């Protein structure tokens, strides 16, 4: 006997806002306001605005000073977090059950009443350079910035970090502008864990009725292609090879997600040869030195990028890439067993379920589901979705990647790294 688990409450308000709650009887509580306001809604005149914005979460509001937001949240031992992706910003707030009220209020002020004071913004500008420096010390961050800048001519080309030329150039007005035209009802979701539906619906009805900005989730990603190359010196070579795939939510994307597990995501066993990983086994056959390879799968509102990512020694780069690429080619040519897909299904299904088992991963999923779909789709039917993917679809996903206009980013000693041209 545990408690019989409650059900998630869902509501679209007439104004377009979405509310989802689950009373999980947890000792803590989590509230997330998710907004369609990620990096993609920046333009060529205001790049990095949503970065500084992400950094601005405890500046002064009408109704709560900077010092209050900090000391108030710290007094009760809660958190205020902000997570941007290319599509969303997500303001998250954690605390003990008894303290939902003060943190909610803070939440609402940060998101709906930010004052962006001239001198406070001025003082925060240098955090962009530190924030960028701390991320960019993973070779993967620049590779995925560059991969996007090359893939798209457009909105998903924008990076989640602010371009250097913009640091200290983002104006208090640019952020006011970004909020007024992106942090609106129809671009928003208020998700609550360890909270009640009436209370969320109340604050939604009272505080989140904002509308007077943009409409489209698709200001529209024009996929283009090409490559970016960054000579580095840097110990070993990072390379991502990618083609346009499928928009999140569509049936096609699920085939891509299965393809990713046929070929290989991250490891499952601490220090292993990754036996089921068909990409890893393929490179390993003729590369007898330190390397890594994984399938890369990025899904967005109106586009997607599938392919693989490689880490290798400078001189092995081209061999590692060509081996990985040919391995994909064999799956497009038809060489894929039924148990191969069955294992990928199980790897995906299990992985998804594990992805939502904590309240942090749960809230983020319900949030991203609310924005991308306007729905909550239970695990039971997500697993049914996955099951409906046939072997022939996974083959068709590989066929699309092979024959589609590529995109490539890479960094290191590029001396022996190929050029799309030569793939």
């Amino acid at each position: 006997v545990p408690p019989h688990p409650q059900d998630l409450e869902f509501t679209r308000l007439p104004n377009g806002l979405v509310i989802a709650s689950l009373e999980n009887y947890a000792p803590a509580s989590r509230i997330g306001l998710f907004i369609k306001a990620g990096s993609r809604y920046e333009n060529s005149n205001n790049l990095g605005t949503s970065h500084l914005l992400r950094l601005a979460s405890s500046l002064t509001t009408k109704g709560a000073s900077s010092f209050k937001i900090t000391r108030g949240i710290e007094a009760v031992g809660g958190k205020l977090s902000v997570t941007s992706t290319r599509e969303n910003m997500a303001y998250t707030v954690e605390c003990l059950r008894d303290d939902v009220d003060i943190l909610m209020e803070f939440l609402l002020n940060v998101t709906t009443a930010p004052e962006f004071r001239r001198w406070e913004v001025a003082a925060l500008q240098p955090q962009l350079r530190i924030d960028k420096a701390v991320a960019l010390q993973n070779p993967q961050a620049h590779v995925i910035e560059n991969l996007h800048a090359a893939a798209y001519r457009n909105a998903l080309a924008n990076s989640l970090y602010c371009p250097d030329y913009r640091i200290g150039k983002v104006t208090p007005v640019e952020l006011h502008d970004y909020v007024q035209n992106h942090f609106t009802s129809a671009r928003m979701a208020l998700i609550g864990l360890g909270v009640s539906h009436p209370v969320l619906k109340q604050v939604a009805e009272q505080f989140l009725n904002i509308r007077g900005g943009l409409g489209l989730s698709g200001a529209k990603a024009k996929y283009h292609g090409g490559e970016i190359r960054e000579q580095n010196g840097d110990s070993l070579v990072h390379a991502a090879l990618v083609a346009e795939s499928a928009a999140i939510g569509s049936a096609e994307a699920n085939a891509f997600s299965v393809l990713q597990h046929v070929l290989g995501a991250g490891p499952h066993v601490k220090r292993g040869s990754n036996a089921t990983s068909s990409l890893y086994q393929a490179v390993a056959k003729g590369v007898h030195q330190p390397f890594d390879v994984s399938a890369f799968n990025a899904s967005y509102s109106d586009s997607g990028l599938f392919g693989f990512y490689t880490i290798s020694q400078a001189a092995s780069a081209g061999d590692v890439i060509k081996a990985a690429y040919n391995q994909v080619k064999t799956i497009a040519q038809g060489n894929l067993s039924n148990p191969d897909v069955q294992a990928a299904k199980n790897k995906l299904k299990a992985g998804y379920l594990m992805s939502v088992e904590s309240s942090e991963g749960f809230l983020d999923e319900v949030g991203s589901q609310a924005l991308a779909a306007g729905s909550y789709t239970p695990p039971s039917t997500v697993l049914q979705q996955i099951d409906a993917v046939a072997d022939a679809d996974v083959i068709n996903a590989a066929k699309k990647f092979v024959s589609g206009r590529k995109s490539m980013a890479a960094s290191g000693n590029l001396g022996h790294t190929p050029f799309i041209d030569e793939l």
Binding site: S65, F67, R71, R118
Partner: protein, 105 residues
């Protein structure tokens, strides 16, 4: 009519003229003693106002040296006295007092 409130204002106008910073082209907020709250509010002023402030003080310290005042026409009129610092300093004290209140509990 506001007969009392314009004599209680006329004493002020008298005092202002007697204070005589206006003779040296100054504004009331240019003459304030710089403590931490004031130093902060000077810091928070926008470029235009800060620049204008520096010039007035330079021109004041210049005359104060040559032991002069400006021609009468060029003095600051009590009416034309822009209280440009007050809202900045009000905000700094309001911020400090919140700290001092938080330090109490």
């Amino acid at each position: 009519v506001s007969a009392s409130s314009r004599w209680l204002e006329k004493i002020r106008k008298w005092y202002y003229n007697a204070a005589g910073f206006n003779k040296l082209g100054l504004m009331r907020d240019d003459t304030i003693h710089e403590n931490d709250d004031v130093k902060e509010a000077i810091r928070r002023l926008p470029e235009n106002l800060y620049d204008d402030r520096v010039f007035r003080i330079k021109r004041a310290l210049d005359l104060s040296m040559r032991q002069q005042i400006l021609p009468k026409e060029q003095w600051t009129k009590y009416e034309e006295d822009k209280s440009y610092l007050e809202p900045y300093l009000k905000e700094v004290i309001r911020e400090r007092k919140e700290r001092e209140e938080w330090a109490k509990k």
